[PDB]
């Protein structure tokens with residue numbers, strides 16, 4: 001059976017992608033390898049076994065794959081947070097900046113979150129933390145209480161100190177894998 | 182316990198979205214309601230219980246959520262098919278047209294699929310079938326054999342006869358829910 005470390009070994013670092021100067025972390029092989037995906041999924045689910053999560057909020061398409069898997073594994077519903085224009089109906093919005101794109105607008109359907117929810121935010125990679133900080137804000141504007149937000153990321157690039165950045169709004173941050181030094 | 186019909190009742194039809202003249206099928210409430218998501222997931226997994234699927238290929242972000250859930254449930258890897266520019270590394274490409282967007286380019290990482298694979302393509306909604314037809318093409322260019330491709334969609338809008346369109350390349354098409362007449 002593969003371990004989280006084995007999953008880690010499947011990650012590829014692609015230079016100058018999408019734009020030059022950006023070291024892209026390709027997590028694709030963890031997702032296409034069942035034993036590696038199970039290892040990472042189990043790590044997340046065990047971690048929140050005693051946390052009364054009511055919804056998993058996947059941050060953009062990048063967080064949909066494992067986000068959905070975790071939601072179904074925990075037995076809670078999944079809610080998508082997407083760039084503006086993709087979600088229909090009443091929505092809450094917020095504008096932010098991420099590692100290789102500045103001026104993005106995220107949205108969430110108003111009806112999917114509120115005061116009663118305990119949210120597990122999920123993102124594939126934690127870089128500058130701009131996307132996550134914006135995501136916490138959105139959840140809170142929708143009515144989720146600050147103390148009821150937890151964060152999970154598959155891969156953390158500690159060098160960019162995104163953790164401290166996000167720590168201004170949420171300090172319950174669990175990363176499955178951290179970039180090797 | 183909710184049934185597939187109950188899941189169906191959670192779907193909302195949004196008029197003139199994203200552009201006027203388009204009747205958008207909002208599947209969001211099935212995904213945020215665990216009992217409805219379980220009902221649909223179970224329907225898909227039972228259906229392919231005896232099919233030797235080796236990979237689930239989710240068609241764009243729209244197919245990532247349930248696509249990932251099905252992949253992990255079946256115990257196979259998940260492979261993303263995305264619009265051009267989003268996937269890094271060597272890729273196979275193809276250009277198509279969908280209900281409210283003409284001139285889209287889809288891609289798949291070359292290394293994720295090949296001759297040995299039995300693919301379950303998954304898309305959230307089957308409309309004109311342009312996206313699916315293009316997806317089958319991509320899989321085949323990557324090396325997947327025509328007889329080794331199966332298709333699953335969560336919701337089928339039969340009125341647009343996408344099924345016959347896709348039937349030119351693949352006739353193994355299972356839709357969980359079909360639009361009411």
Ligand SMILES: Nc1ncnc2cc[nH]c12
Pocket residue numbers: 022023024025026098099100125127
């Ligand atoms: N360096 C990086 N690698 C992979 N995904 C992201 C997303 C933001 N920054 C990234």
Ligand SMILES: Nc1ncnc2cc[nH]c12
Pocket residue numbers: 203204205206207279280281306308
């Ligand atoms: N009418 C429609 N509703 C929801 N999703 C899609 C995707 C293509 N056409 C659609």
